[PDB]
Design a protein around this nucleic acid. Structure first.
Lengths: 50, 750
RNA sequence: UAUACCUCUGCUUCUGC
RNA sequence: AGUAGUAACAAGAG
């Protein structure tokens, strides 16, 4: 779907080469995978956090 | 199928001849990610691991856990050893004074006389320095200013006198103060009139607050070292930790290093502080003599050597003994001066970086654990590697989140003085009047020992003695990395010898690219690097001509300044294409304005602006070199000629180039990350000093060129000058009666 | 909480001799 | 996921 999106977006009549942030593009680029930062006080209180 | 093997070149060409092909310097150097606490703690443990059989005591000053290996029991294994015996150092030092007559008192004099002339501003020319006030690394120039302003509150105005001696006298005295006050800017709201619905606006003004700390806290902060990890360190798999020093210690190191530097210059068997061709010239002659002096019908052997755990073993208390011996004839005030720097390193404290990051993979969360909160968490949540380290750190760990590191030289800084201790070993030359004669070279940790004897059986026995001699000074030779062979070829500080030092082009290869100062500067640097490599590092004219090609490529893409006739599309290239059409003398256009590249082997030494000046249009050269153009700014004497270069071996040395000051000689915007942090307040603080200095330079134009001298007020100077300027302009008749009275009126208020 | 599909940032959350 | 490799990023902040 991403390859097809590329071939479609690169083939179109538009000036821009931008790609819409689709479900497949988001997965492919790996969207919002960063671990959420929390306070030291909560992290030290939490046991599962190692 | 024909299976190509690259090593098969070594069958035809010898390793040294084609050593350049054993250096992967087209590739990416190793960088560090996240924290360096695990690397620092490792160093902290390993430093004490080599000193654990010494004497452990508690500092009555700091209240820390200290370890003293010096004059400890001698080792019974090949494991690194800090157990250096004082007598064996003093003997080796004595042996140096015998071999080099009256060098110590001569070197002491030169340093002592220099110390008197040394100004306080000598501490500005440094890299990122630890600032005790804010407890973060900052530029040396600021880190100095923050200390001077802080010392003025606690009433220590030795800095004002101009000399470094009274400022150093203040630093050791500042330890005696019971409380040390320092400014800590804190924001305050303030209504200001505006054209709002409610005609006003709130602007958060900075206000300086007097914050105090106890006698003990300051003493520790003064002895504290801030730790990181060595980034871009070549030819290394795993990473290692380094440290930055405070403004207090930096004063005394400068003198002791300058002292050892004076000795090293005059010592024959030292690779420092000489460099470049001068270094080769020395080592060549040294090698020629050490070769041709050997007994006929014998064997001369060169040990291609290296010392492992250099900084981790060498003790400050040995370095203290070294200064006391060197300053024996010099007066008592200088003896005590040189004794401080080692005394500070002897009771130094290590800051353990950021800390450790803990994460739940399921929850997908993360959080940094500050160094003071390392034992807040049960050690079951840390991984095996860190768990073991943290337990071994425990008996050295302080509650504030630091480690007492009495042994070792975490940061280093003593390179010249550490070389001398190495030379002292090379000075002994024999033990027990045996049938061998050793003598080597020293570049801090790096060494190359020559041995002349009857047969090789004798040579190795002679090397075995050097190894056992170095153990008593605290120098551990690396059995792993070090190797031996019959004289003719050897390695010393990435310089390869084979009946003469062989060319190694790969070491200087990274420098050929765009250095990243600006368009006009980088062009000069680029060619100056090419022409200097043709000379020193043996680059043939074909490769040299290609190095010019490959530069203009990297230059044109980096600064997006391709030829005018070329139809490569880009925001800038659009105006470049118009300039090409507008301009008649297109050969006169610079490469940065989409002009042609006219450089070749011969004219590398001439600036681009000078080469083309005659070929330029009269309008274009006017624009390019407009005296009052907005791009260039207030040029500093260093800002025009000099610029930084980072070669993969030694410290960052600033080389000088030749370029004409034109529109292309611009500066880049400041890092704007500061705007979002609480550091904002420093922006105002800067622009305040900026006004004062810029107005002082308007009164005294020579201030930009040569450093202004005077212990009097900065206003007092500006007042008296502008008073005279007005008086003389009136009597000469440049100033009118209307303006003179107004001038004398305004100055009357001051 | 709310403004916030808004605003600021890209070496300035520690780069030594 | 992936980069990467003894520890991080896979955006941060008001």
């Amino acid at each position: 779907k991403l390859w097809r999106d590329c071939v479609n977006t690169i083939s179109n009549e538009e000036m821009s080469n931008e790609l819409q942030k689709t479900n497949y593009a988001k997965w492919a680029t790996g969207d919002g995978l960063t671990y959420q930062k929390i306070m030291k006080e909560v992290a030290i209180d939490d046991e599962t956090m190692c | 199928g024909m299976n190509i093997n690259p090593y098969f070149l070594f069958i035809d060409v010898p390793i040294q001849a084609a050593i350049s092909t054993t250096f992967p310097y087209t590739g990416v150097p190793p960088y560090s990610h996240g924290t360096g606490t695990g690397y620092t703690i490792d160093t902290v443990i390993r430093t004490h691991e080599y000193s654990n059989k010494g004497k452990q005591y508690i500092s009555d000053v700091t209240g820390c856990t200290m370890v003293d290996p010096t004059n400890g029991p001698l080792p019974e294994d090949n494991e690194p050893s800090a157990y250096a015996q004082l007598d064996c150092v003093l003997e080796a030092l004595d042996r140096m004074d015998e071999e080099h007559p009256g060098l110590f008192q001569a070197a002491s004099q030169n340093a002592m006389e220099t110390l008197m002339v040394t100004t306080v501003d000598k501490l500005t020319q440094g890299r990122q320095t630890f600032d005790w006030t804010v407890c973060r690394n900052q530029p040396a120039a600021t880190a100095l200013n923050t200390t001077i302003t802080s010392f003025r509150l606690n009433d220590l105005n030795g800095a004002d006198k101009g000399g470094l001696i009274p400022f150093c006298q203040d630093i050791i005295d500042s330890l005696d103060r019971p409380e040390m006050t320092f400014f800590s800017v804190k924001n305050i709201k303030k209504k200001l009139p505006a054209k709002n619905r409610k005609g006003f606006l709130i602007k958060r003004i900075p206000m300086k607050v007097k914050d105090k700390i106890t006698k003990v806290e300051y003493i520790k902060r003064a002895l504290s070292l801030n730790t990181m990890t060595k980034d871009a360190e070549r030819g290394k798999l795993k990473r290692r930790a380094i440290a930055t020093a405070g403004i207090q210690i930096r004063g005394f190191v400068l003198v002791v290093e300058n002292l050892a530097k004076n000795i090293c210059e005059n010592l024959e068997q030292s690779g420092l502080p000489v460099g470049g061709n001068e270094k080769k010239a020395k080592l060549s002659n040294a090698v020629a003599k050490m070769l041709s002096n050997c007994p006929p019908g014998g064997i001369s052997m060169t040990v291609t050597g290296d010392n492992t755990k250099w900084n981790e073993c060498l003790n400050p208390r040995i370095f203290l003994a070294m200064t006391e011996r060197i300053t024996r004839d010099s007066p008592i005030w200088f003896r005590d001066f040189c004794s401080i720097a080692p005394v500070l390193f002897s009771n130094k404290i290590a800051r353990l970086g950021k800390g450790f990051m803990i994460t739940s993979k399921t929850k997908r969360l993360k959080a940094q654990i500050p160094c003071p909160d390392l034992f807040s968490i049960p050690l079951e949540r840390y991984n095996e590697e860190t768990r073991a380290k943290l337990k071994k750190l425990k008996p050295f760990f302080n509650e504030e989140g630091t480690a007492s590191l009495s042994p070792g030289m975490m940061m280093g800084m003593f390179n010249m003085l550490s070389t001398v201790l190495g030379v002292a070993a090379l000075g002994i030359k024999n033990i027990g009047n045996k049938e061998y004669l050793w003598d080597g070279l020293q570049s801090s940790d790096d060494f190359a020992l020559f041995v002349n004897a009857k047969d090789e059986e004798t040579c190795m026995e002679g090397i075995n003695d050097f190894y056992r001699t170095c153990k008593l000074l605290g120098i551990n030779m690396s059995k792993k990395k070090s190797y031996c062979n019959e004289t003719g070829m050897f390695e010393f500080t990435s310089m390869f010898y084979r009946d003469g030092f062989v060319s190694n082009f790969a070491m200087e290869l990274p420098s050929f690219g765009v250095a990243g100062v600006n368009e006009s500067a980088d062009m000069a640097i680029g060619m100056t690097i090419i022409k200097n490599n043709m000379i020193n590092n043996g680059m043939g004219p074909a490769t040299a001509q290609t190095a010019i090609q490959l530069f203009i490529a990297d230059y044109r893409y980096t600064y997006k300044c391709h030829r005018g006739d070329s139809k490569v599309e880009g925001k800038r290239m659009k105006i470049i294409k118009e300039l090409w059409e507008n301009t008649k003398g297109r050969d006169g256009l610079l490469v940065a304005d989409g002009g042609p590249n006219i450089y070749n082997l011969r004219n590398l030494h001439i600036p681009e602006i000078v080469l083309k000046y005659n070929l330029m249009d009269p309008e274009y050269k006017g624009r390019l070199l407009h005296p009052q153009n907005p791009f260039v700014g207030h040029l500093s004497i260093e800002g025009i000629k000099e610029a930084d270069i980072t070669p993969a071996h030694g410290p960052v040395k600033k080389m000088d180039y030749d370029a004409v000051s034109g529109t292309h000689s611009w500066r880049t915007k400041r890092n704007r990350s500061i705007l979002n942090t609480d550091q904002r307040n420093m922006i105002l603080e800067e622009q305040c000093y900026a006004k004062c200095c810029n107005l002082f330079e308007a009164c005294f134009n020579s201030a930009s060129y040569r450093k202004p001298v005077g212990q009097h007020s900065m206003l007092e100077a500006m007042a008296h000058r502008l008073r005279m300027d007005a008086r003389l302009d009136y009597e000469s008749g440049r100033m009118s009666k209307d303006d003179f009275e107004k001038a004398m009126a305004h100055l009357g208020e001051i």
